[PDB]
Design a protein around this motif. Structure first.
Motif, mmCIF file in Angstrom:
data_model
loop_
_atom_site.group_PDB
_atom_site.id
_atom_site.type_symbol
_atom_site.label_atom_id
_atom_site.label_comp_id
_atom_site.label_asym_id
_atom_site.label_seq_id
_atom_site.Cartn_x
_atom_site.Cartn_y
_atom_site.Cartn_z
ATOM 1 N N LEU A 1 29.729 48.404 -3.454
ATOM 2 C CA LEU A 1 30.564 49.702 -3.877
ATOM 3 C C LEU A 1 31.610 49.811 -5.204
ATOM 4 O O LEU A 1 32.311 50.277 -5.425
ATOM 5 N N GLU A 2 30.861 48.779 -6.045
ATOM 6 C CA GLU A 2 31.413 49.412 -7.565
ATOM 7 C C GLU A 2 30.593 50.328 -7.813
ATOM 8 O O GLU A 2 31.097 51.062 -8.475
ATOM 9 N N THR A 3 29.246 50.417 -7.582
ATOM 10 C CA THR A 3 28.038 51.245 -7.799
ATOM 11 C C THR A 3 28.716 53.278 -7.450
ATOM 12 O O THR A 3 29.409 52.560 -6.644
ATOM 13 N N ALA A 4 27.647 53.895 -8.286
ATOM 14 C CA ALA A 4 28.651 55.488 -7.560
ATOM 15 C C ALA A 4 27.447 55.418 -6.380
ATOM 16 O O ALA A 4 27.351 56.738 -5.837
ATOM 17 N N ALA B 1 26.882 58.391 -2.245
ATOM 18 C CA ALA B 1 25.536 59.129 -0.833
ATOM 19 C C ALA B 1 25.721 58.245 0.482
ATOM 20 O O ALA B 1 25.427 59.273 0.891
ATOM 21 N N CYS B 2 26.696 57.623 0.645
ATOM 22 C CA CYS B 2 26.404 56.842 1.951
ATOM 23 C C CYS B 2 28.325 56.967 2.311
ATOM 24 O O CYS B 2 28.682 56.327 1.811
ATOM 25 N N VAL B 3 28.746 57.561 3.203
ATOM 26 C CA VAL B 3 30.041 57.079 3.667
ATOM 27 C C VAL B 3 29.805 55.475 4.315
ATOM 28 O O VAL B 3 28.858 55.437 4.844
ATOM 29 N N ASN B 4 30.488 54.700 4.868
ATOM 30 C CA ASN B 4 30.188 52.645 4.843
ATOM 31 C C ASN B 4 31.161 52.609 6.147
ATOM 32 O O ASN B 4 32.358 52.292 5.936
#
Lengths: 49, 49
Positions: free
Chosen positions: A17-20, A24-27
């Motif tokens: 979640l800290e990565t961008a 690319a993916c709604v989670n």
């Protein structure tokens, strides 16, 4: 004779979640995969002329 | 009641398909009129002098 060992920490990686990559993916977190077989999404497109 | 109001939504979406496919006919023909009176540059440029 009692001894003491030397162990290093496991190299930690903070969850993505800290990565961008979250762009690319709604989670949506999901509660039971052994209960879902084949999920699906249906589209309905009306088309003008 | 959920079939009466499930087919009146069909005909309005076939009425909204009516008018908002005719509004192309403005934008189609007015673009088509301007192309009927469209000389290119290599013709008109020397005449404009």
């Amino acid at each position: 004779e009692a001894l003491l060992g030397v162990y290093t920490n496991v190299v930690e990686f903070v969850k993505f979640l800290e990565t961008a990559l979250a762009a690319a993916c709604v989670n949506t977190e999901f509660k039971d995969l052994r209960r879902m077989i084949d999920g699906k999404i249906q589209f309905k497109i009306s088309m003008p002329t | 009641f959920t079939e009466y109001a499930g087919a009146i939504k069909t005909i309005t979406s076939a009425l909204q398909f009516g008018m908002d496919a005719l509004e192309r006919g403005l934008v189609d023909t007015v673009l088509a009129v301007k192309l009927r009176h469209a000389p290119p540059v290599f013709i008109l440029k020397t005449l404009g002098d």
